[PDB]
Amino acid sequence: AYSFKVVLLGEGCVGKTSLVLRYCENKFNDKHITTLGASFLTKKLNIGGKRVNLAIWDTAGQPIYYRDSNGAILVYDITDEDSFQKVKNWVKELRKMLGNEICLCIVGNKIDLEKERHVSIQEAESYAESVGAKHYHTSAKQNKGIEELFLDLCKRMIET
Ligand SMILES: Nc1nc2c(ncn2[C@@H]2O[C@H](COP(=O)(O)OP(=O)(O)NP(=O)(O)O)[C@@H](O)[C@H]2O)c(=O)[nH]1
Ligand SMILES: [Mg+2]
């Protein structure tokens, strides 16, 4: 019934692979196993009787990849201010290439490290709203908010 392409973008520290690995295999590593290039995995969802097939693309965080993407997940580290500010560049590039068609997610990952938070939740949420994106909080380490993120993204892509 539905087939969607989703790309994860963000800096080297943020947890892109960790989000996908937790969602697809229910595994997590404290080790930073550096992603050397882009690749995709397939995840199947059944929402309202409707079969949704996701092509989830991972990228090396350190145009050809996000071409024809139905959704983009822009990941930052809540303990790293630089990683949040970097999200803004991605939004600009994606909106120039694809317009309002692409469903954007701005994702504050590592919420298990709330004690070490350096990104303003209010700034992040405000920014997300200003660019027509939705903001999400996740922890790949504790498996929090990930099911909700992908489910909501799928709902929004179906509604497009
Ligand atoms: N505490 C905590 N650490 C996390 C979380 N998600 C990822 N990390 C940690 O952040 C580091 C980088 O994770 P990784 O998923 O490899 O990031 P990446 O965005 O794929 N990096 P790259 O672009 O280089 O492949 C690892 O040490 C990993 O354990 C999380 O939710 N909480
Ligand atoms: Mg990675």
CSV table of C-alpha atoms in Angstrom, one decimal, residues 13 33 44 52 85 118 139:
chain,number,residue,atom,x,y,z
A,13,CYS,CA,28.3,12.3,17.4
A,33,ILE,CA,31.1,2.3,15.0
A,44,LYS,CA,7.8,-2.9,7.4
A,52,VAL,CA,4.0,0.6,4.9
A,85,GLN,CA,22.9,24.4,15.1
A,118,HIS,CA,23.1,21.9,26.4
A,139,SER,CA,17.1,7.8,23.4
